[PDB]
Amino acid sequence: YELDYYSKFGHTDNYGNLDLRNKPYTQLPSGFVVKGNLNISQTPIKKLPKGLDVGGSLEATNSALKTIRSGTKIKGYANLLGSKIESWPRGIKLGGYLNLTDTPLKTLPAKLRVKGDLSVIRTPISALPEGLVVDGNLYIGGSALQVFPDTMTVKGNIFLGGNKITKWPSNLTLGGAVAP
Amino acid sequence: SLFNVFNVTGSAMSAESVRLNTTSSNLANADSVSSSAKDTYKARHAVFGAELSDTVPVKVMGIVESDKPLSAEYNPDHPLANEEGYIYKPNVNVMEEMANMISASRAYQTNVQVADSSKQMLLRTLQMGQ
Amino acid sequence: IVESDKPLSAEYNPDHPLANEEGYIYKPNVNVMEEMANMISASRAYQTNVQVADSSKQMLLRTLQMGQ
Amino acid sequence: MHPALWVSKTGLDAQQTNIATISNNLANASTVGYKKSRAVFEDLFYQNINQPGGQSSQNTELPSGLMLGAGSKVVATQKVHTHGNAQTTTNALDMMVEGDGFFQVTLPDGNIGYTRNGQFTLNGEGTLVTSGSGYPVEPEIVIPEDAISITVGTDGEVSVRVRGQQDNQVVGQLTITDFVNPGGLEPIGQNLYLPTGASGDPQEGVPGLDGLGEIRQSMLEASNVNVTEELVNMIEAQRVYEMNSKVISSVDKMMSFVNQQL
Amino acid sequence: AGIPGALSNQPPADASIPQDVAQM
Amino acid sequence: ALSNQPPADASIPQDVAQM
Amino acid sequence: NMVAGIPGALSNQPPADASIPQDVAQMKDGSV
Amino acid sequence: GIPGALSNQPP
């Protein structure tokens, strides 16, 4: 079934964080607003509603989340560890890091900006989008990436983690170090 | 060897200490409506795990929070009350914490006996050759 | 090493996130009373063989003194 | 944990939910149109211990066929929809259903909510709404401002009295929804219920035909809670709670004797 | 790995991925 | 395990925003 | 450097509970 | 020297 207004109230804390862990909810109403953090870990939710607003961070670790629609506003970070997300939509306003470890993610939006750290660890992604900007640490360990785009920006450390990079960006300014 | 018993039993001594501290924080936060970190505390549990990697030490793999819904109480005049007027309190269950308190103490003390038992065997093994 | 054939100890706890459909968490089939007895039996039997091995060396040492 | 500790803890947890269920019933002892809930206990899974697997029958009375249960739990807070008494009041907008049937109100999120409480009133526009949050009552009944009296018939036929015109004008008609399984309704507070899969599709109709109840004006339905039943339930639940605590204390003392004597 | 919902002891920052927990 | 530098202390703030 | 402070109940408290004197809490970092 | 220590001599 689907979450109602009264069922929403029974999964909210004092400061306004929605906890849906292991709960049997399949879809959320459109134009959904959360006062604080949102947790949809281990949920059978396969799609996030259009116009979704989260006043905190989105937690979807080891969930069945697959599709996020554009226009979603997230003030905190996005944690989609172990979910079933295959692509990242364009135009997501993310106020924090993006953790996509152990996901079937294949494609990323062009010129994507991550205000925090980025993770593509053990993902089947083949190539990073052109003009990528990362303000934190980039972990690509165990992924299928082997060629970086012509231009990219990482303001922290770059962790190869084991994968072999052969074509480095022509224009790259690094605020940290590169680790294998 | 008999020294591996000390590593295995010693790991359980630390393991049961983690669960005791987690229970202590649960008992002390059973009536705390507010919390720094913008999160209404929820009951935490230490999930043990055998690290097979003969001798199988026990390791704490991380603390996990309770899945029970928070206890909602209608307190309309509280500053933390929502529009409907309900304030939410942690889902700490007193009875399970008391049961965890007993089990953690009983398991902690029986690991001391095994370490003591292995100690005597090593001392006798050293008396051979003298 | 062989695992025991005793059925796992089932506990009703629809709060642990690692539970199942019926709210059951299965726990190891370890019996404390049989572990205490094994601890007593293992320690005593281990130290008994220390005495036999230690006394065996004495017999070997006395053999070297034959004819002296 | 020794299994006896957790088996006793299930009884403590089960009785704890029973106390909370009883406490809510006594809290709503004056709520109009309230239905008492009771906690239902059932035994948990029974496990063969002295057998490697669940060998069917085969000497159940012998030590090989020993079976130990896992405790008890509260399986459902069953709603008892017994008809309550009648509260005769002088208000002209509070109404009562005699028998099976529910009032239908319009919830803000679009779906309709079903209530047994009859404390209704009017809003600024004259629509018949509830006296709590103010939800409109289905079907919409608008009262003209020229009306000097309101009459609600035995089948929801609402009439008004207009000065300068004999005979009462009909301004609408009420309906009451019936369900096959009243206990399957989901309570959402505010004396409201929602239809679930266990309840069934709503059955609407005129209040007084098709087996439905009849609308009584200037009446209310008192809560059907039996305060003596709750007090008797409290006595038993408290005693069972204390008994299972002794078993937990007994197991701990036995375990204390083991690693201390040995 | 192991448990899926382990916590993190580091203070919230919302910008750095917590490496205290086994994030795999 | 061991390390070549002292571990940091523990922070117990009444408001995490001010650390 | 020398590190010191009040042991026991007073130190095993959150800093908000100002049981520990301010200068003694300074010593708990480093001194020379 | 612990700043502000009590002494052990009549004030």
| Angle made by CA atoms B96, B100, B105, in degrees to the nearest 5 | 155
CA distances from B95 to D17, D238, D248 (A): 12, 15, 11
Residue-wise DSSP of C6-52? SPPEEEE-TTSTT--TTSEEEE----HHHHHHHHHHHHHHHHHHHHH
Residue written as token pair 């293992």: C42
Neighbors of chain D with 3 or more C-beta pairs under 8 Å: A, B, C
Of the candidates B52, B55, B27, B51, which has an alpha carbon nearest to the alpha carbon of residue B41? B27
Give the whole-angstrom CA distance, residue G9 versus residue G19: 10
Q: What is the chain G residue with the closest CA to H4?
A: G23
Give the whole-angstrom CA distance, residue D152 versus residue D173: 9
Q: And the tokens for D110? A: 């679009």
Say if the Cβ atoms of C39 and B117 lie within 8 Å.
Answer: yes
Check residue B37 and give left, alpha or beta (phi > 0: left; psi -120 to 50: alpha): left
Give the whole-angstrom CA distance, residue A154 versus residue H2: 49
- CA B59 from chain centre, in angstroms, equals 12
Residues 6+ apart with CB under 8 A from B81: B75, B87
Residues in chain F, total? 19
Neighbors of chain B with 3 or more C-beta pairs under 8 Å: A, C, D, E, F
Residue of A81, A98, A103, A143 for testing the chain E interface, max E β-carbons within 10 Å: A81
Q: CB of B65 within 8 A of CB of B42?
A: yes
Q: CB of B86 within 8 A of CB of A9?
A: yes
Biggest CA pair distance of chain A: 55
Q: CB of D27 within 8 A of CB of D6?
A: no
Q: What is the chain A residue with the closest CA to C14?
A: A22
Physical contact, E and G (3 or more Cβ pairs within 8 A) = no
Give the whole-angstrom CA distance, residue B47 versus residue E3: 8
Flag whether residue G24 sits within 8 Å of chain H, measured between CB atoms: yes
* Contacting residues of B for F16, CB less than 8 Å apart: 36-38
Amino acid in position D165: Q
Flag whether residue C32 sits within 8 Å of chain B, measured between CB atoms: yes
Residue written as token pair 């030490």: B57
Q: And the tokens for B123? A: 């001392």
DSSP structural state of residue D182: G
Q: CB of D33 within 8 A of CB of D118?
A: yes
CA distances from B98 to B92, B95, C30, C53, D162 (A): 11, 5, 22, 49, 70
Q: CB of D215 within 8 A of CB of D174?
A: yes
Q: What is the dihedral of CA A41, A43, A48, A51, to 10 degrees?
A: -70
Residues 6+ apart with CB under 8 A from D23: none
Q: CB of D183 within 8 A of CB of D81?
A: yes
Q: And the tokens for A122? A: 């053990």
Q: And the tokens for A132? A: 């990528």
- The 3-state secondary structure of chain F, one letter per residue: CCCCCCCCCCCCCCCCCCC
Residue of B41, B70, B84 for testing the chain A interface, max A β-carbons within 10 Å: B70
How many separate helices (H) and strands (E) can be counted in chain E?
0, 0
Interface of A with D (CB under 8 A): 4-6
CA distances from D28 to B63, B89, D223, D225 (A): 39, 22, 7, 8
Residue written as token pair 């004197």: G21
Long-range contacts of A20-25 (CB under 8 A, 24+ apart): A20/A45, A21/B67, A21/C17, A21/E5, A22/B67, A22/C17, A25/A1
CB atoms within 10 A of CB C21: 6
Q: CB of A69 within 8 A of CB of A48?
A: yes
Amino acid in position B125: T
| Angle made by CA atoms B47, B49, B50, in degrees to the nearest 5 | 165
CB atoms within 10 A of CB A116: 23
Backbone angles phi, psi at D176, to 5 degrees: -125, 135
Tally the C-alpha atoms within 13 A of residue D186's C-alpha that lie toward its C-beta: 12
Residue-wise DSSP of D46-81? EEE-SSSS---SSSTTSGGG-EEE--EEEEEEEE--
Beta bridge partners of C26: C10
Give the whole-angstrom CA distance, residue A137 versus residue D32: 61
* Contacting residues of E for A77, CB less than 8 Å apart: 14-15
End-to-end CA distance of chain F: 27
Q: In Å, how far is F4's CA from the nearest CA of chain B?
A: 23
Say if the Cβ atoms of C32 and D258 lie within 8 Å.
Answer: yes
- Classify the C-alpha dihedral D230-D234-D240-D244 as positive or negative: positive
Give the whole-angstrom CA distance, residue B129 versus residue B115: 24
Q: What is the chain C residue with the closest CA to E6?
A: C17
Backbone angles phi, psi at D142, to 5 degrees: -100, 130
Q: In Å, how far is E10's CA from the nearest CA of chain F?
A: 10
Residue written as token pair 């520990």: G20
Looking at the partner chain, which of E6, E12, E22 has a beta carbon nearest the beta carbon of B64? E6
Question: Is the bond preceding residue B79 a cis peptide, omega within 30 degrees?
Answer: no
Q: CB of A19 within 8 A of CB of A41?
A: no
Give the whole-angstrom CA distance, residue C55 versus residue C50: 8
Say if the Cβ atoms of C43 and B120 lie within 8 Å.
Answer: yes
Give the relative orientation of helices C32-64 and D227-261 as an angle to the nearest 10 degrees. 0
Residue written as token pair 């006595």: D235
b/e D58-89 (16+ beta carbons within 10 angstroms → b): eeeeeeeeeeeebbbbbeebebebeebeeeeb
What resolution, expressed in A, was reported for this entry?
3.0
Physical contact, A and H (3 or more Cβ pairs within 8 A) = no
Tell me if residue E8 falls in helix, strand or coil: coil
Q: CB of D96 within 8 A of CB of D222?
A: no
Q: And the tokens for B121? A: 């065997």
Residues 6+ apart with CB under 8 A from F5: none
* Contacting residues of F for E12, CB less than 8 Å apart: 16
Of the candidates D116, D239, D246, which has an alpha carbon nearest to the alpha carbon of residue D178? D116
Beta bridge partners of D193: D114, D187
Residues 6+ apart with CB under 8 A from H8: none
Of the candidates B16, B3, B2, which has an alpha carbon nearest to the alpha carbon of residue B106? B16
Neighbors of chain E with 3 or more C-beta pairs under 8 Å: A, B, C, F
Of the candidates C11, A160, C1, which has an alpha carbon nearest to the alpha carbon of residue D10? C11
- Sheet with strand D157-162: strands edge to edge: D147-152, D157-162, D169-173
Tally the C-alpha atoms within 13 A of residue D91's C-alpha that lie toward its C-beta: 14
Tell me if residue D173 falls in helix, strand or coil: strand
Experimental approach: cryo-EM
Give the whole-angstrom CA distance, residue C17 versus residue E7: 13
Q: In Å, how far is D61's CA from the nearest CA of chain A?
A: 41
Q: CB of A140 within 8 A of CB of A122?
A: no
CB atoms within 10 A of CB C47: 16
